[PDB]
Amino acid sequence: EKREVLAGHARRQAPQAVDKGPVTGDQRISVTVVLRRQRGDELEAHVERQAALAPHARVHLEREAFAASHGASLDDFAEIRKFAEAHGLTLDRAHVAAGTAVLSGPVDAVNQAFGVELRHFDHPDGSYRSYVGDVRVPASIAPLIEAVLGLDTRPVARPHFRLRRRAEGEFEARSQSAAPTAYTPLDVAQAYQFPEGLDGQGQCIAIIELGGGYDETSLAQYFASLGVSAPQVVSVSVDGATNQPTGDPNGPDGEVELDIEVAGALAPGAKIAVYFAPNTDAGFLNAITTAVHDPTHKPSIVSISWGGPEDSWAPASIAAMNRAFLDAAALGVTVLAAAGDSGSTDGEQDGLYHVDFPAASPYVLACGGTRLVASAGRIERETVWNDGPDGGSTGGGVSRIFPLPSWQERANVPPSANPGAGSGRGVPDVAGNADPATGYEVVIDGETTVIGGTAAVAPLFAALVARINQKLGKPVGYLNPTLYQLPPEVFHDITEGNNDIANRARIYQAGPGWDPCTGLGSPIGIRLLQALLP
Ligand SMILES: [Ca+2]
């Protein structure tokens, strides 16, 4: 019958990608379809509505009631199964609350079902399969499908951490005022006045990982060296991915282990659930929906240190991710994400500034990066993290996908620096120490070293939220609107520096109040808690 284009799936060949022929032989391949769901408008409105309410008197939805009220319908899954069967695909697994389904079949079947021709591509960052053109499905099913992910398997995200390269002191003079010292997460938390007497007991922090793994020896050695009891850590497999260390310190293991060590050191009473998934748009989405809707571990917080330029994703994939973050906000789950570690250009050399996703989502607490100089438990100096082209810098900027939220509009978010300007959601929301030169001591694959990157800030603040949730007795959930309504005295304002590592324009620059390098600044823990208490 007639076919219909599914919006947001158009793709031209990627820059630097080389076509290596059609995918054939017909091995079995899997994709994730995102279905329409019941009462989608009400869901968005409910969250957008609760904004005018302090998170300690709001009404969030419950996981057990969510599927029936806002999940995809069984009638719709039946139609998706009919569509699958009619094209040689199988509906392998349904996720009712999240409103998604995994379908698999030989390439010819996937090609036919979605109106694409999958091709092999070689690229400097890794070979993958993808399509050039658009996705078209039978008109009869088109209304039921909002997105198809996994057709393109290019690595979708980068873990936003960096290993320290320089540790040696100044020749004929060893001083301390910005380096070459390092901190434990506890030292940083003290500088940010995290509320004490709290360890996150009763909370579960979900940590999303798109590669690598952790080993118990590195973790045990780390916590023992701090003289603290280690948190309970469990691994969760998504789409067949598992806890699989590779042994490379600059590989995904570095991210996995720093995430656990930073969050665990500060909220050792929290259960840390680590969700492993493939590094593809489908894997990333499935890791987030699995954690957000997890009936077993029931996380109250999700920490993400992986991401990619918002323009490197298919629009339909970003929309599906954003919907999963809307679910988290509706369910009272806080989602934090590193804002990027490659400055205002986010690792792209096309002559444009780019912000990183998921940080760009209005439903995510975007975490920027600073260089922190602290001593005797106090902040002596805190500036924008910018160590140049090869050293990295905090992500930050103006989204070209998401409009400026009403709750963020009074902050000093500027128009985009790109040609044409234009308003958009400002990145980041808050910031914390991320400079490897004033980094965090960690144990990665058995060795003691120092790391930085905004990848450390998401777990740092995830632990802060866990402590605050413990004190409040109930989860704070979606915090963004609240943060922008709080008095400025709740934050340590960063006013000096810029996150431009591409040119001399000082792209974006810090200043009094909100800026596109550090957002509202570093939270002052005890003040934030006090402001959230009834
Ligand atoms: Ca500022």
Swiss-Prot record:
Cofactor-binding details, from the entry: Binds 1 Ca(2+) ion per subunit.
Keyword Calcium appears in the UniProt entry: yes
Catalytic activity: The enzyme preferentially hydrolyzes peptides having an Ala or Pro residue at P2 position and prefers such charged amino acid residues as Glu or Arg at the P2' position. In the oxidized insulin B chain, kumamolysin preferentially cleaves between Leu(15) and Tyr(16)
The record's account of how the chain is modified after translation: Autocatalytically processed.
Result, substituting residue 259 to A: Loses both auto-processing activity and proteolytic activity
Domain (Peptidase S53): residue spans on this chain: 182-534
Substitution effect: residue 209 to A: Retains auto-processing activity and 6% of wild-type activity
Keywords tagged on the record: Calcium, Hydrolase, Metal-binding, Protease, Secreted, Serine protease, Signal, Zymogen
Enzyme class: hydrolase
GO molecular function terms attached to this record: metal ion binding; serine-type endopeptidase activity; tripeptidyl-peptidase activity
Enzyme nomenclature, EC number: 3.4.21.123
Entry remark concerning the domains of this protein: The core of its prodomain resembles the prodomains of the pro-subtilisins and of the pro-protein convertases. The prodomain may stabilize (by interacting with helices h4 and h5) a folding intermediate of the catalytic domain. The catalytic domain has adopted a mature-like conformation already in the proform.
Name assigned to this protein: Kumamolisin
Organism: Bacillus sp. (strain MN-32)
